[PDB]
Design an enzyme around this catalytic site. Structure first.
Site, short mmCIF file in Angstrom:
data_model
loop_
_atom_site.label_atom_id
_atom_site.label_comp_id
_atom_site.label_asym_id
_atom_site.label_seq_id
_atom_site.Cartn_x
_atom_site.Cartn_y
_atom_site.Cartn_z
N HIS B 39 31.43 -1.21 21.78
CA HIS B 39 30.29 -1.45 21.27
C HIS B 39 29.85 -0.88 19.83
O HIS B 39 29.33 -1.57 19.07
CB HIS B 39 29.08 -1.08 22.14
N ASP B 61 33.64 -1.35 28.09
CA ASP B 61 33.15 -1.27 26.52
C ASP B 61 33.82 -0.08 25.85
O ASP B 61 33.36 0.47 24.99
CB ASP B 61 31.56 -1.13 26.31
N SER B 113 27.57 8.13 20.54
CA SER B 113 28.62 7.87 21.36
C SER B 113 30.06 8.07 21.03
O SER B 113 30.47 8.10 19.88
CB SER B 113 28.59 6.21 21.46
#
Lengths: 49, 162
Positions: B39, B61, B113
């Site tokens: 992502h 992802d 992330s």
């Protein structure tokens, strides 16, 4: 001269065509079942922990 | 401890994902192959590593790519021993309980992330991908691996991509 609709069949060749039409349907039904089983196995393996 | 964790993360080749001059995430090399959250858009902050072609994994992802053995020389050390307690990561400590990682509220946001979770020995136990507001704390969405090698992704209901 009735000429029933299902009168032009030839038993053996008709069965051959039955295997050609719908036999692949049986094959893809088996494939769908196997794919669903594999997906359920993957989900079970992931959720197992 | 946090000082040593940051020193280990910096000494090990880790590079944020730069896009238009903005840090949109982080990526690291564990077990000798690069991983990247799918992502997050952009390129790794390393021309040599950027030359590596990545493969996509929509289900989690996440992306992965092969790292040259000479660069595999020094990567993160993974372990499967994940007992309950507290671990350390870039933004402080993380509480592990009931199989879930939780951190105090206000820790973690969009762009974090890719930050791994380290144990007392400096071994990676999980990778932080997102999170969701949990009142006085927040629960992080992470991926962890058992001793059998099974990839398990824990995602809270309605988790936000952080």
């Amino acid at each position: 001269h009735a000429q029933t609709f299902t009168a032009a069949v030839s038993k053996t060749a008709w069965t051959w065509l039955t295997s050609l039409l719908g036999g692949s349907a049986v094959i893809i039904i088996i494939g769908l079942v196997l794919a669903t089983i594999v997906a359920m196995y993957v989900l079970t393996n992931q959720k197992h922990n | 401890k946090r000082q040593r964790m940051v020193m280990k993360l910096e000494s090990d080749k880790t590079f944020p994902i730069m896009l238009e001059g903005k840090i949109n995430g982080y990526a690291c090399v564990v077990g000798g192959k690069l991983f990247r959250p799918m992502h997050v858009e952009g390129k790794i902050d390393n021309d040599v590593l950027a030359a590596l072609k990545t493969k996509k994994a929509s289900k989690y992802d996440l992306e992965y790519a092969d790292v040259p053995q000479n660069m595999r020389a020094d990567t993160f050390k993974y372990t499967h021993e994940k007992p309950q307690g507290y671990y350390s990561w870039h933004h402080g400590a993380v509480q592990y309980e009931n199989g879930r990682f939780t951190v105090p509220k206000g820790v973690g946001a969009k762009g974090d992330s890719g930050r791994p979770i380290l144990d007392n020995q400096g071994r990676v136990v999980a990778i932080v991908l997102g999170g969701v507001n949990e009142g006085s704390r927040t629960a992080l969405s992470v991926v962890m691996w058992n001793e059998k090698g099974v990839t398990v992704k824990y995602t809270p209901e309605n988790c936000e991509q952080w």
